[PDB]
Structures are given as structure tokens and as C-alpha cells.
Design a protein around this ligand. Structure first.
Ligand code: HEM
Ligand code: HEM
Ligand SMILES: Cc1cc(N)nc2cc(-c3ccc4c(c3)CN(C)CCO4)ccc12
Ligand SMILES: Cc1cc(N)nc2cc(-c3ccc4c(c3)CN(C)CCO4)ccc12
Ligand SMILES: C[C@H](O)[C@H](O)[C@H]1CNc2nc(N)[nH]c(=O)c2N1
Ligand SMILES: C[C@H](O)[C@H](O)[C@H]1CNc2nc(N)[nH]c(=O)c2N1
Ligand SMILES: [Cl-]
Ligand SMILES: [Cl-]
Ligand SMILES: [Gd]
Ligand SMILES: [Gd]
Ligand SMILES: [Zn+2]
Lengths: 401, 401
């Protein structure tokens, strides 16, 4: 039972929950690989049994009637058909647990407040798009954001697979050049190549919201132009730097990830887009200041008249902080839900204590919980963490080509 | 072999050096514990044999007459005495390799430029003090800091260890109190109590330099005061916030870690203090802003007239950025060597490139290498790393009391 210390307070806990990890991680006694982003058939019944046992443990209903009975029909369902279908409430319980189990998510204090949209009966790129469009509008909610996941049908052998080709529902274009360099988002130049290579008319500028590439089983993808009224965006202004607005920066309201594979009780949902709301460093620090993203940091420091000739003026740090101030200020002025990294990390420490008494620990990936600016100014920095894989979970999956 | 990606640039390498990992860390395939701070002649023979092979590789004499002679010699001396002695050149090479191998050190671009003082003939605590004073004097060098290590006699059967009880050669007292609060550095309350109970007359300032507690084999520790003019200090001021000088903040020039164990070819040196020069975030962010250290952040933000009643104003990030500016400016004004986190991490990237060519990899602990502020603004943030233990090495050891 791994001993875990908080160095700011001096408190000690034990992660007894780690003793129940499934999928082995990338680390061995000889070398740690925790900093790696992507680490490198009756098996279905073992994972199905275990997920059902989880479900009835939570609702105080282990070791009695419906517990016994629910065990049998999945046995028979797999005996007869080879796969199985989840009860709607089990799908709800599995989705919240996969969120609860995400080691890299700092927002998990919210894990119990999740809206599960069941799309398991879907069957075309036209049905997808409507299900996706109801999500975005419910999730956006005029800027009062609400966490939501939409679950498309559970993959089965012999036939294709529902998949969304974009990494997220809202992405910005990335256009090449005579010189390779990109107008717009460099992280999306590739999926921008597939949209133009499928009928889409390439726009001009930096913040062109890409269309969707939606794929029903076996049939090729189909473009879908998102409605401008459905894609809520926030223009970026600074409370006291009047020229910041003139830089023409924007970001969208809804982070909705659409390339991860939801896995519950041995079943795989390659299309299950989930969404919440942004922590501000995600936008201001990574999306806008990463050298391989919008890379705006030097442009903002010039406007602030900072001395960029020597790193020791800390001009990168000063301009970064102001970009984050502008993100927080702009989202709040537009009445769009956002959380700063101080509030978010303090809530995550509260989640750690909750999960300690409820489950005896919590899988947390230190390198992703600590924010990308001002790390040691937040409490999670001084908190040791244990990382491991619990089920149900969100997994990465290959790109569909 | 582990594949390692840099995400800023897209490059990819394989850490083949990790396969030679001479010991075992705390991670298993079940669970990663990378974020934890604190993770027989036959075996002395094989450790020694491997170090000797390393030494003769570095001087391009592998498998030679002189190489096999030294193996037979070492084996003979372990049989006759249970231990063996390093040649002077072997000691210098082993001390540099220990620095080179240290996974949490961002300063390793410098590893070949290290001054090795051989104090293995030291006989008492009094001589030990003289060796240490000369180390401080050489390393400080009137502000033009030089990297050095002094190595005291190795652990040997029959006699006790040389130990320095202080965790660094220069530290500020931390005086307990009631109302419960610490005056001075709270990290040093325990050593401060030990000094008092060994006959030190305590001051009552916030930056009182502690005496040295030095243990000769099979002797109680002996108190030694450092001559005030040996301990170079830097009063902290800010280039534009003139009230900052009125805080009365100071820090010392020389970071000299004295409580670690140096291991070379199976031999152990429990007393071998080493020093380099500061990276400004260790002082500004950690030593001054950690809530459990000097904890000046809120007092600085109030003075800056920042809005401290809400976190989304990012008052903490703005105050910490100015504390770091003050540190860098104060040290440059005083002509005392200092490196900012941007230059340091950029030189660490060159070290990784050098090391990949030389040894096929480099042990690095991502969470220690990424600075405590402005993490993703530095290039080490976007570099994946492999953490593992090579020997020779600096190891932690328990406190002598
Ligand atoms: C409600 C507010 C939420 C906040 C503030 C939040 C915040 C974050 C942040 C900051 C990250 C890492 C940033 C990065 O990877 O660059 C992350 C990752 C993640 N989040 Fe959350 N999140 C929220 C809701 C959710 C929801 C609703 C789900 C799913 C139902 C979820 C599941 C995940 C997962 C699986 C990851 C891992 C990403 C990966 O491994 O690539 N989160 N979240
Ligand atoms: C010359 C300039 C140097 C710089 C800029 C530097 C930088 C650093 C920094 C920033 C840390 C981590 C501090 C923290 O924990 O917050 C560190 C750790 C460390 N340094 Fe360096 N260092 C230097 C010289 C040296 C030398 C000369 C040695 C040994 C001969 C050394 C050995 C180590 C070791 C062993 C650690 C790990 C400490 C631990 O594991 O607890 N360093 N270094
Ligand atoms: C629900 C939710 C809310 C939120 N606020 N942020 C989220 C961020 C991700 C995310 C997913 C994958 C991923 C990365 C971030 C980052 N790295 C930079 C590269 C690609 O991998 C996923 C879900 C989020
Ligand atoms: C030679 C050298 C130069 C330099 N500039 N810094 C150094 C820092 C350390 C260090 C050693 C141990 C350690 C910590 C830092 C940090 N944490 C805060 C708690 C205790 O563990 C050791 C040697 C350094
Ligand atoms: C190499 C390193 O693991 C990689 O850059 C990680 C670090 N921590 C992160 N943390 C978050 N939240 N998102 C990321 O993309 C990363 N990237
Ligand atoms: C718990 C956490 O791992 C711990 O506070 C670490 C994080 N990274 C660090 N990195 C450095 N350089 N120094 C430190 O003291 C720490 N502390
Ligand atoms: Cl994003
Ligand atoms: Cl220090
Ligand atoms: Gd101007
Ligand atoms: Gd001023
Ligand atoms: Zn690990």
C-alpha cells in the first residue's frame, strides 16, 4: 500500500485503491515512463462481471435479488449473441466512473454531475450529426456550461464503426504555405487537409471553425458544416491593455473531445464525445502560447514593450500571465463558464480528500494535474500522487486511417 | 527500448541507456510512483567491476593490460580487507559521473567542469571544518561561482561515518515560537533545535546563518561557526518596485548540499558536500513563496496593490513573477552567478542532445526538471523523459540523529 505525503501540510495517506488496477501501465522497477503522453473472445465476461459488481456496490445493493439476476442475463446475452447491451442506468453509472477514473483530469470534483445522452440506437452520419448538435447546444446552454457525454453504439465484430474524425467538435483551421508555415492552428493542419480533401471550401484566416467529418460504419466519412449559431465563441480582450482586442484573438466556449474510446464493462464505444468547461490555462497557456500552437507569446510581449533581448527579464512569464488574465476576463464578460487554475487545483485537492474516504485513494497523474503555469503556487504541486488504470475508463485509440 | 518524443519539434529517440539501469526504482506495471520525493563481497565486487570498466572506457583503455590489472587488484584487496581504495583519477571520474547521472538535476550541461577536492585523508572534525571552509571559499570565488565537491573518507568496516548534520553548508535558522509560528526558514527548525541543544547561542532574526554540526567517526557532532565573511549573501531588491528592498529579504550565494551520499563502485562516501550555483526559481518561487517556507507571496501581492480577494485576478502568478525578477536582478547587481529557468532548461535540452549521442540516452525526472513556474514556456515541458538509476550516483541517506 503506497504511502503518499503532502509536503505543504505534512499529512500522510495510503492508496489502498491502487491494489485493484487492471491494465498494466508503462513503468517497470528499472525505469519510469510516467512522462510519456501515449504509453506504447470470452474475456468479455470477466470485465462484464466486474463492472456489474461495481454497479450494485455503489447503490447499496450487493448480494441480493437484482444483483444475482442481472449477472445471469449478461451471461446468457453473451452466451447467445457474443456481446451484450447495458441497462441505461448502468451506462450512466459507467460514464461517470470513467470520468471519476481519468488520472489526467483535474476537474473530477464534478464527476457526479454528468448528463448522459444515449445514442446507442443511432445508424447514420445524419443521425450522428443531430445527436452531436443536441449535445453542443445542451452543453453550451448560452454559456452556462454543463458537462455532457453522448454515447454512440457499442462496436461489434463483422461490421464497421462509428467514429468522429476530429479530435474535438470545435477546432480551428490550419492552412499551409509556400513555406509550410501555418495560418491558423498548427495542431489541426492534418484534419484540415482531410476536410479540403472531402469537399470543404478553405477559408481565409486563423480562426475558421473546421467542419465535422462524421463516419458511419463501413461508409466513408461525410462533411457536416456546423451551424455558426451553435458554435459559441469568445473574442479575447484584456481588462486594461486596450490594444489586446486588436490582436483579433478568439477561442471557443466548449471543450468537447471526440476521439477517445469509452470502455465500460468490456464494451467499446469508439464514438462517445464528452464535454465540460475550460480551465483557463488550457486556452491561454497551451493553445495560444505553445511554440507549436498559435505561438503568440512574443507578439504579446512586443505590444507590452517588454525587453525580449534577454530571457532574464522574464518577459515570457509576464506576457503569459497577461494572456491568461485576458482569457479569464473575456470569458467572464461573455458570461461563459471558465475556471482558473488556482480554483481548479484547490477543488481537486478537495476531490482527493473525498475520494480518500470513499474509495481509499484516487488515480492521479501528477504531470497533468499540475497546471502549465505557476505549478508550485498551486496545492497539487506539493501532493504526491499514484497513477494507475481503473475500469471503466476513457482510452486513446488509433486514428481512423 | 523506450521511445521518447519531443512534442514541440516532433523529434523521436530511444533510450537504450535505460536498459543498463544498475538498480530499481519505485514503479511497477501496476502503478507509477514517479512523483514520490523519497522513492557481502560478491556484490561489492560486481559494482566495483562495473565502475572500473566504466573508468577504463572513458580513458579509451577498455580490455587493456592496465584494465585487467586493476580488476585483479580490486578483487585481491576485497579478499584481503573487505573493501578497496579508489585511485585519485578514479575518484574524480566517479564524482563527475555521479553528477552526470543525477536525474533531478537540470544543471548537468556543466557535469564535466567539476572541481574535486580529495579529503579522504581527513582525520577529525576540526580538519573537516578546514576542508569545508576552503570548499566554500573556492566555490564562492567572490561571486563568480565554481562547481565543486569535497569528498571525505569512505564508509569502512570498523569505524563510524564522517557526517555533516546540516542539509546544506549555508542555511538560515528557523526558530519555533508561540504563537506557533516560525521565525526564519521553517524547513530548518529541526537542525536549528539540534544546534541549540549542542551549545549554539541562537539569534532571533529571519536570516541567521546556522553553525555547522560535524561528526567525526565514533564521536558526537561538533559545532563550528562559519566566519561571517566566508558566507556571501545578496540583499534582495526589485528593479522597479522600490518598496521591495524594505522587506529586508536576503539569500546566500552558494547552494552546497551536504547531506547526500556519494556512491562510487560499491564504495560509499556518507560525507561529500557539493555545490554549484542557483537557478533563480529555487530562491524566488520555492524558498520565498512556498506556503511552508518564507511564504511572502500574499504580502508582496498586497504591496503591489493586486486584488487578492479573488483568484481569477491571478494575483499569485503576478506576485511570484516579480519576486523572481527581484532575485535575478539582485544577484546580477551583486555580481553573483545565477541562471534563470529559461536559460537553464535550454541548456538542459542541449545536454540531452549531447547525452543521446554519447550514451544513447539520459536519466531525467520530468517533474523535477520542469521549473516550478512557467513550466510549459520552457522546452523541457514538451520533452518526454525516462527516469532510472545509474551508478555512480548521489543517493539520499537518513539523518544521523
Ligand atoms: C467540468 C469541468 C472539467 C474541467 C475543468 C476539466 C479539465 C481538464 C484538464 C485541464 C485536462 C488536461 C488538459 C490537457 O490534457 O491538456 C483534462 C483531461 C481529461 N479530462 Fe477533464 N475537465 C472537465 C470535465 C471532464 C469531463 C466531463 C470528462 C469526461 C466525461 C473529462 C475527462 C477527461 C479525460 C479522460 C482527460 C484525459 C485527456 C487525455 O488523456 O488525453 N473531463 N480535463
Ligand atoms: C552548476 C550549476 C547547477 C545548477 C543550475 C543546478 C540545478 C539544480 C536544480 C534546480 C535542482 C533541483 C532543485 C530543486 O529540487 O528544486 C538540482 C538538483 C540536484 N543537483 Fe544540480 N545544479 C547545479 C550543480 C550541481 C552539482 C555541481 C552537483 C553535484 C556534483 C549537482 C547535483 C544535483 C543533485 C544530486 C540533485 C538532486 C537533488 C535530490 O535528488 O534531492 N548539481 N540541481
Ligand atoms: C473534458 C475536457 C475538459 C477540459 N477542460 N479539457 C480537456 C482536455 C482534453 C484533452 C484530450 C486529449 C489531449 C489533450 C487534452 C492535451 N494534449 C495537449 C494533446 C492531445 O491530448 C480532454 C478533455 C477535456
Ligand atoms: C548542487 C545544487 C545546485 C542547485 N542550484 N540546487 C540544488 C538543489 C538540491 C536539492 C536537494 C534535495 C532536495 C531539493 C533540492 C528540493 N526539495 C525542495 C526538498 C529536498 O530535496 C541539491 C543540489 C543543488
Ligand atoms: C512530455 C510531457 O509529458 C507532455 O508535454 C505532457 C506534460 N503534461 C501535460 N499536461 C496536460 N494537462 N496536457 C499535456 O498535453 C501535457 N503534456
Ligand atoms: C510532491 C512533488 O512531487 C514534490 O513537491 C516535487 C515536485 N517537483 C519538484 N521539483 C524540484 N526541482 N524540486 C522539488 O522540490 C520538487 N518537489
Ligand atoms: Cl483545447
Ligand atoms: Cl536552496
Ligand atoms: Gd506603443
Ligand atoms: Gd517604481
Ligand atoms: Zn513511473
Amino acid at each position: 500500500f503506497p504511502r503518499v505525503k503532502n509536503w505543504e501540510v505534512g499529512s500522510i495517506t495510503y492508496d489502498t485503491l491502487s491494489a485493484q488496477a487492471q491494465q498494466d501501465g508503462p513503468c517497470t522497477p528499472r525505469r519510469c515512463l510516467g512522462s510519456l503522453v501515449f504509453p506504447r473472445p470470452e474475456q468479455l465476461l470477466s470485465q462484464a462481471r466486474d463492472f456489474i459488481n461495481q454497479y450494485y456496490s455503489s447503490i447499496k445493493r450487493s448480494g441480493s435479488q437484482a444483483h444475482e439476476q442481472r449477472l445471469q442475463e449478461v451471461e446468457a446475452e453473451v452466451a447467445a449473441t457474443g456481446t451484450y447491451q447495458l441497462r441505461e442506468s448502468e451506462l450512466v453509472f459507467g460514464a461517470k466512473q470513467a470520468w471519476r477514473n481519468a488520472p489526467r483530469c483535474v476537474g473530477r470534483i464534478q464527476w457526479g454531475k454528468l448528463q448522459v445522452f444515449d445514442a446507442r440506437d443511432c445508424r447514420s452520419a445524419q443521425e450522428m450529426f443531430t445527436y452531436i448538435c443536441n449535445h453542443i447546444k445542451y452543453a453550451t446552454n448560452r454559456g452556462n456550461l454543463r458537462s455532457a457525454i453522448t454515447v454512440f453504439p457499442q462496436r461489434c465484430p463483422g461490421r464497421g464503426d462509428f467514429r468522429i474524425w476530429n479530435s474535438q467538435l470545435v477546432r480551428y483551421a490550419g492552412y499551409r504555405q509556400q513555406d509550410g508555415s501555418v495560418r491558423g492552428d498548427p495542431a489541426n493542419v492534418e484534419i484540415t487537409e482531410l476536410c479540403i480533401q472531402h469537399g470543404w471550401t478553405p477559408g481565409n484566416g486563423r480562426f475558421d471553425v473546421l467542419p465535422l467529418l462524421l463516419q458511419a460504419p463501413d461508409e466513408p466519412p461525410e462533411l457536416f458544416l456546423l451551424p455558426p449559431e451553435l458554435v459559441l465563441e469568445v473574442p479575447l480582450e484584456h481588462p486594461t491593455l486596450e490594444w489586446f482586442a486588436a490582436l483579433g484573438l478568439r477561442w471557443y466556449a466548449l471543450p468537447a473531445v471526440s476521439n477517445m474510446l469509452l470502455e465500460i464493462g468490456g464494451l467499446e464505444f469508439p464514438a462517445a464525445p464528452f464535454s465540460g468547461w475550460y480551465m483557463s490555462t488550457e486556452i491561454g497557456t497551451r493553445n495560444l502560447c505553445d511554440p507549436h500552437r498559435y505561438n503568440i507569446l512574443e507578439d504579446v510581449a512586443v505590444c507590452m514593450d517588454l525587453d525580449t533581448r534577454t530571457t532574464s527579464s522574464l518577459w515570457k512569464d509576464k506576457a503569459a500571465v497577461e494572456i491568461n488574465v485576458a482569457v479569464l476576463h473575456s470569458y467572464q464578460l461573455a458570461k461563459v463558464t471558465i475556471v482558473d487554475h488556482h480554483a481548479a487545483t484547490a477543488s481537486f485537492m478537495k476531490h482527493l480528500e473525498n475520494e480518500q474516504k470513499a474509495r481509499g485513494g484516487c488515480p492521479a497523474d501528477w504531470a497533468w494535474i499540475v497546471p502549465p503555469i505557476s505549478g508550485s503556487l498551486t496545492p497539487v504541486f506539493h501532493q504526491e500522487m499514484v497513477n494507475y488504470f481503473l475500469s471503466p475508463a476513457f482510452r486513446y485509440q488509433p486514428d481512423p486511417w
